[PDB]
Amino acid sequence: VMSNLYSLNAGSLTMSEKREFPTVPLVKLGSSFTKVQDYLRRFESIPDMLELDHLTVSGDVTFGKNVSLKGTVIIIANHGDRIDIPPGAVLENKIVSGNLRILDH
Amino acid sequence: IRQELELSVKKELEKILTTASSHEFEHTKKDLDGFRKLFHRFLQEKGPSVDWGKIQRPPEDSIQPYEKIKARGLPDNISSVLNKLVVVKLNGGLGTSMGCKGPKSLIGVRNENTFLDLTVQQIEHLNKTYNTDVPLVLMNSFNTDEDTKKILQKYNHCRVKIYTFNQSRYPRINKESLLPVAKDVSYSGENTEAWYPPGHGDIYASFYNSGLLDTFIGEGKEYIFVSNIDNLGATVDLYILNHLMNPPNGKRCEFVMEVTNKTRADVKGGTLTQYEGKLRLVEIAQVPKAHVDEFKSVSKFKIFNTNNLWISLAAVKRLQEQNAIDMEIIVNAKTLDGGLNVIQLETAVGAAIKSFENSLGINVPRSRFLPVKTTSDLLLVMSNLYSLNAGSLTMSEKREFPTVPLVKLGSSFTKVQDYLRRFESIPDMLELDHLTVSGDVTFGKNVSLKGTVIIIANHGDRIDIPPGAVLENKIVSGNLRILDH
Amino acid sequence: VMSNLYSLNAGSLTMSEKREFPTVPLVKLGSSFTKVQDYLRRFESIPDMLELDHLTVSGDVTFGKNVSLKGTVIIIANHGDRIDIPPGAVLENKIVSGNLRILDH
Amino acid sequence: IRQELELSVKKELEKILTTASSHEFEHTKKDLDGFRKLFHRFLQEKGPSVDWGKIQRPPEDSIQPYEKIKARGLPDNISSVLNKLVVVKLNGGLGTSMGCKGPKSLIGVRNENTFLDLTVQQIEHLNKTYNTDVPLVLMNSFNTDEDTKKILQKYNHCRVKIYTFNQSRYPRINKESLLPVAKDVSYSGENTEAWYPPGHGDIYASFYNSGLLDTFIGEGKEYIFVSNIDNLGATVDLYILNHLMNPPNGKRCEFVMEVTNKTRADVKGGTLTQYEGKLRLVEIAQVPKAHVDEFKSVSKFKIFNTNNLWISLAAVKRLQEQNAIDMEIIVNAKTLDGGLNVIQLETAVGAAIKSFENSLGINVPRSRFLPVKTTSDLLLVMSNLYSLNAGSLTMSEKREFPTVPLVKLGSSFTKVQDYLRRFESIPDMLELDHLTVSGDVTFGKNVSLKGTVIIIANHGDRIDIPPGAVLENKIVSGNLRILDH
Numbered sequence A, C: 001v002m003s004n005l006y007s008l009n010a011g012s013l014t015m016s017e018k019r020e021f022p023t024v025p026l027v028k029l030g031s032s033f034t035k036v037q038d039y040l041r042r043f044e045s046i047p048d049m050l051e052l053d054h055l056t057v058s059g060d061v062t063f064g065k066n067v068s069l070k071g072t073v074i075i076i077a078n079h080g081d082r083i084d085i086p087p088g089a090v091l092e093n094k095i096v097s098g099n100l101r102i103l104d105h
Numbered sequence B, D: 001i002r003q004e005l006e007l008s009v010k011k012e013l014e015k016i017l018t019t020a021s022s023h024e025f026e027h028t029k030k031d032l033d034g035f036r037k038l039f040h041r042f043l044q045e046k047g048p049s050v051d052w053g054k055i056q057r058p059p060e061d062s063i064q065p066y067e068k069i070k071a072r073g074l075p076d077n078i079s080s081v082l083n084k085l086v087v088v089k090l091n092g093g094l095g096t097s098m099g100c101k102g103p104k105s106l107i108g109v110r111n112e113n114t115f116l117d118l119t120v121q122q123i124e125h126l127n128k129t130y131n132t133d134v135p136l137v138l139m140n141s142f143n144t145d146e147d148t149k150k151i152l153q154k155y156n157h158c159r160v161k162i163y164t165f166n167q168s169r170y171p172r173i174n175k176e177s178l179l180p181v182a183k184d185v186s187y188s189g190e191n192t193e194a195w196y197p198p199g200h201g202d203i204y205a206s207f208y209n210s211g212l213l214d215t216f217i218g219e220g221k222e223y224i225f226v227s228n229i230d231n232l233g234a235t236v237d238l239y240i241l242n243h244l245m246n247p248p249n250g251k252r253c254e255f256v257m258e259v260t261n262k263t264r265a266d267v268k269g270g271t272l273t274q275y276e277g278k279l280r281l282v283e284i285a286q287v288p289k290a291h292v293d294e295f296k297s298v299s300k301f302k303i304f305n306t307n308n309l310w311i312s313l314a315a316v317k318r319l320q321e322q323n324a325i326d327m328e329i330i331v332n333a334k335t336l337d338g339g340l341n342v343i344q345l346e347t348a349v350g351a352a353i354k355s356f357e358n359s360l361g362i363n364v365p366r367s368r369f370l371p372v373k374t375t376s377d378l379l380l381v382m383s384n385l386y387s388l389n390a391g392s393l394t395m396s397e398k399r400e401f402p403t404v405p406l407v408k409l410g411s412s413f414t415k416v417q418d419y420l421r422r423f424e425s426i427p428d429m430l431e432l433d434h435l436t437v438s439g440d441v442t443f444g445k446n447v448s449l450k451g452t453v454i455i456i457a458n459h460g461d462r463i464d465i466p467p468g469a470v471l472e473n474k475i476v477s478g479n480l481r482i483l484d485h
């Protein structure tokens, strides 16, 4: 609902005219995202989901600004591990797993 | 300059020619002739491109929905139309994508039936029920010709007339220097890396030179139906056939291609446009990089090409006789193990649709387009998700939702041996929707996969899904090993 | 006592006649199964132990519905690791170990 | 509308006022008056209020190269010229960024010497060698005043007259209400929730009201040298002082700020320009909408402000008693304990340069601009890379190349306490160019770092660099625990 997948007017949401395929994508964020505070925290910005179809996020994950999610994206971070998807990242039909931490210099 | 290039290449080509066993010299000469013409055309125009201004969406009567065709009903006498048809299957390729050495056609698909077994079973059963005699023509390649002929013996008692004709063989040409890399050696020289099957497209030239189209046109045949051996959906359709040999208002269509609607997946290409009065198959490479996104857009172009084509022998002969048959030049670059950057010129059978009169598209269900590119497809096709009869696969009546699920097995599964190894049995996928398997994974017997199952095993780790396991909308990760006690 | 290993009638328990041999099997559930609450929560249902001899389960372990245990089963989840036995899983003469998490979708 | 709301706010402030300290009651209003003036002023000009056209680059001789001043620069008499000067240091800052409450000035920088200790040392040694009497003055804040006045007992016997004055404290203002945050709890609820220092501008208002202006101008002082206590480079320069009090052609300069060339790091600061006939300090904020990217361009504006200023007390009195002092209103916002969003108004001391006659910048070497803001700077300053003499740091002459090396310590090193703990001694960094350390890292005694050194201890991991280790153009990673036996 927050993504550009949808458009809001007069308190009414409708799917984007720019959605190439009429269907609503599938998105399952893990337990790390369950609480709204956490959800908001972990998305630097709401990524581009206009071309998205499947999205599975499981572990400890974060999203920088201007990430773009297309088609089937399965990001999975194992227990203990964490994944920091860098900003501007374009994930299209990728399955991304492991343990990556991005730190300030 | 360009002329000097051409003539410089060709007399070197003449030098190559001088090497030949007489066994298959004259048939070599033609191929060289064919190549050379391709090369003459190659430099006739460069940066092959299309004027986007002159492009248009096809008229609504130029791509008819298959359900109208089926609406019309099947023909009054199936025999008389089946006897006017000939089945052609493309067999140019081998199972290296599936990690098998031999021709693809031979890889086992379901219950010890290989692709070829399935095609043969189909046409045979077709004949047996309709008391007709349809031929099967296999367009082989130098990589598959021999490997393939060896096994044709199995079909001596099966009720079908299997033919064969070898596709051309063109020299790979170096990229920087537009010269051929061949050392004037035969096939036996292990210089097979210096040759290639031009195109699925040269079939016109290859089918003409084989003399089978004259046999068949003389034998009272009107149409050939070309498809791939791996495309399990490319059955011979009696409705499409009816619309071909009993045409309404007397419109004879020389060339009709099956198209289907695009998914976000298959945006790849092969969409019909109206260009300069006639239908044209347009591929992404042909489109400028300015309008490449607009070309992919599903509003403007809703369909794409299934290389299921029905063509009239007559028109093939007429057009090939005149060299009026026209297809864009695919310049395909490759770098092989030897460490050599080369290009190889080729053509796509579909692209010729613009040279035929009254060319037509018909939007067939995806059911007719089930390419088995890789082992994940195999998993679909082997499961109870599908049902096999007379070499024809159809989706299970027990599939609650009409869609085909999505399945992506990792690199550990890529090779058929590995795939078979890792599945103790083919699991229940009747209720499946998404399946992603990534790492080192194994499946015991009587596993059941429902909805969205994402099994993921990390690098190094391994997952042994125990037998009888029911995974429904689960995402399972980690490292579990099950050992015998 | 809870399994199909015993049949209950009018309060009275009697070992199932279907049991091949009159011997009672050996079962040792780890510390994570000591409290009745955990135990109950950790077995989505009572598995099939009618052909069981040896059951040893140690560590963080979870059972799905309809699991079938036969002969000798040893399930060892190390410190920090968990093991979720998927439902319907039949284990017959096996030692199963490692770290496997089964999450909903 | 705006005025109607302003007066509404003024009433509230009067409601604030009625509570105060008997002994410290009155001046509060003086501070408060300054506040409204600020409020009036900030509503007077809403928006950019500055075009892009009238701005031009400073003409040459607007700013003179320090090398030109140092040429035949030392005065014939250094006592008399020093006797006319008073040193002012900005002490209204805490070391919370370095993880301590205390005023930043009190944080030990080198060999148990604090920033203050260094300054005091410097001017004391000045006095002792040149037989003069230079005063030192601290601009304190309500966060540092008491804490500073408590420890000033140290320098009782040190030959230097130290004075102190507290800058104004203004009430924060709510972003939507435009009314004072005014929790006023009372101040028992802490100030950060309740009050703030106006940033550097006030210096003119509070330095006058303290009576020190009249004192020093009356004592026989002509000039006042302003800088930060954390800027180790900002020493009393006798050459600048000579070009200042003994100017050529008798042209006296009432205001002069030291600027320096912009490195890639210092492209975010404010820069000197010529606007409407006079030199002015311009800020990013001052440059709305179009033409913004060019401001950053080092081609257009090659220098930035060091905040090392020299001013005439006479000019300050003359301009302050006329309220002719004009600085661009700066508005900033944030909140935390309040769980609020809050606005506070302040000004900048450097901005006032426009309101002075014969304003003149000078381009000093970075030698004089060395702001110690983080532990990473402490490591740099504490190392053999710098030599200490009488509170003055100078880069080692042994340093082959004049450039300062880059060093970045991790989150584990942010607090000076942790930082000190993690270095059994300051390593040799004299041949260092590039140092990056991240994670749980510790250094033994007599470590030597040369060239580029990257030390990465991943999450959970520790790295104990063994003592005496010499690391030269290495990147060390992993997990190593060195224990005692």
Ligand SMILES: O=c1ccn([C@@H]2O[C@H](COP(=O)(O)OP(=O)(O)O[C@H]3O[C@H](CO)[C@@H](O)[C@H](O)[C@H]3O)[C@@H](O)[C@H]2O)c(=O)[nH]1
Residues within 6 Å of the ligand: B090, B091, B092, B093, B094, B104, B139, B197, B198, B199, B200, B228, B229, B230, B270, B305, B306, B307, B371, B373
């Ligand atoms: O020069 C060649 C190469 C391959 N083949 C045969 O045909 C198939 C090659 O086609 P495939 O690898 O299945 O993909 P494409 O070459 O793109 O051709 C067809 O199969 C694709 C399956 O996705 C469809 O997308 C295309 O539209 C359709 O033209 C192989 O099985 C070979 O037996 C030939 O006859 N000649």
Ligand SMILES: [Zn+2]
Residues within 6 Å of the ligand: B023, B024
């Ligand atoms: Zn031969």
Ligand SMILES: [Zn+2]
Residues within 6 Å of the ligand: B099, B100, B101, B416, B417
């Ligand atoms: Zn094989």
Ligand SMILES: [Zn+2]
Residues within 6 Å of the ligand: none
């Ligand atoms: Zn459940």
Ligand SMILES: [Zn+2]
Residues within 6 Å of the ligand: D064, D069, D243
């Ligand atoms: Zn000068």
Ligand SMILES: [Zn+2]
Residues within 6 Å of the ligand: D090, D092, D093, D199, D200
């Ligand atoms: Zn300050």
Ligand SMILES: [Zn+2]
Residues within 6 Å of the ligand: D120, D121, D124, D155, D157, D158, D159
């Ligand atoms: Zn002293």
Ligand SMILES: [Zn+2]
Residues within 6 Å of the ligand: D415, D417, D418
């Ligand atoms: Zn600490």
